[PDB]
Amino acid sequence: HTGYVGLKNQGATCYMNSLLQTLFFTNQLRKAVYMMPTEGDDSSKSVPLALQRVFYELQHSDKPVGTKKLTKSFGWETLDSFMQHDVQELCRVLLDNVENKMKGTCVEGTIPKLFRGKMVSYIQCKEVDYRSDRREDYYDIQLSIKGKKNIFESFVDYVAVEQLDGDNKYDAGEHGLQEAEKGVKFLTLPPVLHLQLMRFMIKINDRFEFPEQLPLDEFLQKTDPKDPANYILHAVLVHSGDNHGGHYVVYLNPKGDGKWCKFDDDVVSRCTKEEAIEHNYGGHHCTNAYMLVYIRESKLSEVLQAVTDHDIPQQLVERLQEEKRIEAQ
Numbered sequence: 001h002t003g004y005v006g007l008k009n010q011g012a013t014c015y016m017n018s019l020l021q022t023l024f025f026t027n028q029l030r031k032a033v034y035m036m037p038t039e040g041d042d043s044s045k046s047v048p049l050a051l052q053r054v055f056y057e058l059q060h061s062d063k064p065v066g067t068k069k070l071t072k073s074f075g076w077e078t079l080d081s082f083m084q085h086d087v088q089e090l091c092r093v094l095l096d097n098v099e100n101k102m103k104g105t106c107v108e109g110t111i112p113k114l115f116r117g118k119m120v121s122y123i124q125c126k127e128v129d130y131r132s133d134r135r136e137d138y139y140d141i142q143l144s145i146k147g148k149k150n151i152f153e154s155f156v157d158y159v160a161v162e163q164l165d166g167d168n169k170y171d172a173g174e175h176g177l178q179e180a181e182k183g184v185k186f187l188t189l190p191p192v193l194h195l196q197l198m199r200f201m202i203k204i205n206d207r208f209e210f211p212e213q214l215p216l217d218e219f220l221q222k223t224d225p226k227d228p229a230n231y232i233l234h235a236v237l238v239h240s241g242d243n244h245g246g247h248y249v250v251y252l253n254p255k256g257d258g259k260w261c262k263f264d265d266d267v268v269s270r271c272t273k274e275e276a277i278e279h280n281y282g283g284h285h286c287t288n289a290y291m292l293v294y295i296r297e298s299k300l301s302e303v304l305q306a307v308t309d310h311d312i313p314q315q316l317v318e319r320l321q322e323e324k325r326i327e328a329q
């Protein structure tokens with residue numbers, strides 16, 4: 001009834017199915033993934049080709065999509081392979097393969113265009129006039145949730161100044177051991193904002209609030225009047241558990257219109273804003289968000305651009321249709 005299809009439960013894949021729907025509904029990345037030159041690749045060893053198959057299937061199949069060819073291609077086939085890692089590691093590995101496969105193509109640099117943000121790490125000495133400014137690149141933000149009640153407080157703590165005193169004094173080189181202040185300052189925020197909520201260090205289930213609309217202009221060094229840092233909540237990656245028996249589900253409003261759906265493996269059903277947002281705050285049952293996806297209001301239309309059958313090359317279609325014919329025998 002939703003118009004969207006789900007993914008098969010084929011093991012202890014955990015967060016894998018949740019990330020797959022998250023990336024699929026990042027329409028600009030989906031289009032880009034289809035434009036990859038996979039014609040000469042091996043149907044078993046290729047991760048970029050495996051990511052296209054899942055994306056094509058999710059776009060056309062009425063039946064729950066299989067991920068067996070994907071899990072094999074990046075070598076996470078052991079009983080607890082996904083339990084040894086995190087959603088951030090899987091996404092880093094998956095997107096490194098699709099961006100590496102985009103080199104030389106027209107769609108080269110899709111991943112930095114959507115996920116790269118500009119940061120500045122600084123160490124300013126108190127008693128000495130020496131400052132070490134280190135401009136860094138980031139593709140996601142790891143937010144601490146323990147003690148913090150909401151995203152604003154987590155961002156306040158993220159940009160907060162650290163004191164380098166006594167035993168943890170700063171090596172100012174020629175100025176010797178100096179008492180200094182360490183902090184981070186945001187230069188730019190990416191069109192696709194992936195926020196990792198540090199619930200897993202053990203698993204913390206304390207109440208943590210996130211808004212539907214997130215204004216982040218107050219955390220930037222310099223603000224643009226023509227382009228404010230207003231972010232629209234797109235995906236809510238959820239987990240149910242304490243230490244054992246973990247169930248992973250993802251909530252999405254794919255069009256960014258505020259009309260949400262619950263993506264529980266093979267079962268995709270329409271849900272309220274409450275079920276997707278408020279109900280995944282945690283506290284008091286045991287259900288909470290571990291990862292959030294926000295899209296910049298100005299980039300909402302471009303990131304979530306319409307994807308049709310014509311946006312998939314004939315060479316890709318021909319190969320996956322042949323693969324369907326082989327398995328139909």
Ligand SMILES: CCc1c(-c2ccc3[nH]ncc3c2)cnc(N)c1-c1ccc(O)cc1
Nearest residue numbers: 088091092095096099111112115139140194
């Ligand atoms: C964009 C993927 C990525 C990269 C990364 C990987 C490959 C790349 N190729 N070009 C830039 C680039 C960045 C580096 N660090 C990360 N933390 C992440 C990341 C982002 C969102 C997540 O939900 C989880 C992880």
